[PDB]
Amino acid sequence: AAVTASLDQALVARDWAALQARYYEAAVAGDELAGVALLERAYRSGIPVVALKEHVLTPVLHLIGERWRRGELNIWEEHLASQVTLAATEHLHRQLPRAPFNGRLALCGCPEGDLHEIALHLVMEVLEVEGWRVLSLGPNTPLFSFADAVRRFSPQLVCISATIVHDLERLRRDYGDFYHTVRQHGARIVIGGAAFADPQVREIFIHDYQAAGLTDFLDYLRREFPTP
Numbered sequence: 001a002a003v004t005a006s007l008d009q010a011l012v013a014r015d016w017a018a019l020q021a022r023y024y025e026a027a028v029a030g031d032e033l034a035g036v037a038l039l040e041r042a043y044r045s046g047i048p049v050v051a052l053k054e055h056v057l058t059p060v061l062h063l064i065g066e067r068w069r070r071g072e073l074n075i076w077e078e079h080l081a082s083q084v085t086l087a088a089t090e091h092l093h094r095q096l097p098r099a100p101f102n103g104r105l106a107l108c109g110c111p112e113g114d115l116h117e118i119a120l121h122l123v124m125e126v127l128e129v130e131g132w133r134v135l136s137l138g139p140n141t142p143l144f145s146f147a148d149a150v151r152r153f154s155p156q157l158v159c160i161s162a163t164i165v166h167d168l169e170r171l172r173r174d175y176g177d178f179y180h181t182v183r184q185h186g187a188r189i190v191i192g193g194a195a196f197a198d199p200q201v202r203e204i205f206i207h208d209y210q211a212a213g214l215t216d217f218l219d220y221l222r223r224e225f226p227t228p
């Protein structure tokens with residue numbers, strides 16, 4: 001009750017710091033329902049889902065990582081935060097209206113060795129809201145699996161989230177065949193994630209667009225893939 005009044009005060013004030021703190025606590029405790037309810041309440045106060053993703057979920061998860069690294073959190077608490085985040089976004093995603101099917105398919109995944117996939121999930125939701133069909137190969141996906149999927153389904157778009165790249169040599173070797181396949185089937189490549197801050201990683205992953213976040217990604221989709 002006292003916590004509710006504080007939370008509504010924060011929602012009326014659009015106080016992102018307060019909202020992040022409340023969400024952080026629910027996430028690291030693994031309290032899915034508190035996370036679900038908080039995110040829905042925040043949405044119904046007039047905050048779009050993308051804004052919640054960019055200015056609540058992302059900052060919180062970044063901070064969690066920093067605290068884990070210093071040993072203030074254990075690794076499983078990051079996992080808890082992931083579960084709560086997945087649950088909270090899915091809840092909202094299942095209940096909110098989507099643009100009608102636009103006749104397009106997006107192939108999504110993360111590279112081999114990377115198990116980070118929340119960003120990918122956020123992106124895939126955004127695509128579906130925009131009317132895309134999405135096929136996820138999930139995290140830790142070899143480029144030949146991407147290539148197979150392209151050969152079978154001929155997607156218009158390939159999205160890659162990369163947080164860590166463990167094997168620079170392997171990806172350097174594999175990328176040629178993958179890229180040639182993409183181009184043969186007329187797909188575009190969009191990349192995003194922390195790993196692409198490394199100039200060498202970015203150079204390997206030949207792309208049509210590199211996204212900073214969901215907002216500019218959406219701007220790309222709207223320019224390059226107009227709504228029918």
Ligand code: B12
Nearest residue numbers: 061065069113114115117118119159161192193211213217
């Ligand atoms: C949660 C977490 C985990 C979870 C992942 C669970 C899951 N996803 O199912 C678990 C516990 C498995 C994990 C494991 C590990 N992780 Co970890 N993890 C994190 C954390 C907190 C991720 C938070 C997150 O998902 N943020 C949400 C997203 C949305 O933010 P984002 O990535 O910035 O994405 C935004 C943009 O980049 C963009 N974007 C991103 N991708 C894409 C793609 C497209 C197509 C588009 C358009 C846009 C886009 O849009 C997003 C929204 O704005 C980070 C901390 C961090 N991020 O700084 C550490 C972090 C990534 N992990 C780290 C490490 C070290 C590990 C481990 C090695 C730890 C260990 N010893 O066990 C392992 C390695 C696992 C592996 N093989 O990859 C380090 C990486 C350091 C480095 N640079 O090399 C980090 C940075 C923590 C730290 N501060 O040290 N991790």
